[PDB]
């Protein structure tokens, strides 16, 4: 009449992870919003376009493209 069990495998990694797949980025990784991302995931939220052409924009901690990024700021709900 005695049971018990200890010893599990928890997050054994401190390094950051893409803000989309939650994977440990090492090579060919980006650094946005004080975090890391993937050169394939890091894209807009609406049009979901790559940020290769130019630079991206941070809107409430979310990757967006000038096109939308701006549209949202104006005609639409926005906070300051
Ligand atoms: Zn990713
Ligand atoms: Zn967009």
From Swiss-Prot:
Residue ranges occupied by any LIM zinc-binding domain in the UniProt entry: 16-74
Description of post-translational modifications: Phosphorylated on tyrosine residues.
Tissue: Macrophages, monocytes and osteoclasts (at protein level). Strongly expressed in cells and tissues of hematopoietic origin. Highest expression in lymphoid tissues such as spleen, lymph node, thymus and appendix and in the vascular smooth muscle. Lower levels in bone marrow and fetal liver. Also expressed in peripheral blood lymphocytes and a number of hematopoietic cell lines. Very low levels found in epithelial cell lines. Expressed in prostate cancer (PCa) cells and its expression intensity is directly linked to PCa progression.
Subcellular location(s) per record: Cytoplasm; Cell junction, Focal adhesion; Nucleus; Cytoplasm, Perinuclear region
Function summary: Transcriptional coactivator for androgen receptor (AR) and serum response factor (SRF). Contributes to the regulation of cell adhesion, spreading and cell migration and acts as a negative regulator in integrin-mediated cell adhesion events. Suppresses the integrin-induced tyrosine phosphorylation of paxillin (PXN). May play a critical role as an adapter protein in the formation of the adhesion zone in osteoclasts. Negatively regulates B-cell antigen receptor (BCR) signaling.
Family statement: Belongs to the paxillin family.
Subunit structure: Interacts with PTPN22. Interacts with unphosphorylated ITGA4. Interacts with PTK2B/PYK2, PTPN12, AR and SRF. Interacts (via LD motif 3) with LYN and the interaction is induced upon B-cell antigen receptor (BCR) activation. Interacts (via LD motif 3) with PTK2/FAK.
Domain description: The LIM domain 3 is critical for focal adhesion targeting and the suppression of paxillin (PXN) tyrosine phosphorylation. The LIM domain 3 alone or both LIM domains 3 and 4 can mediate interaction with AR.
Name this protein carries in UniProt: Leupaxin
Organism: Homo sapiens
Species lineage: Eukaryota, Metazoa, Chordata, Craniata, Vertebrata
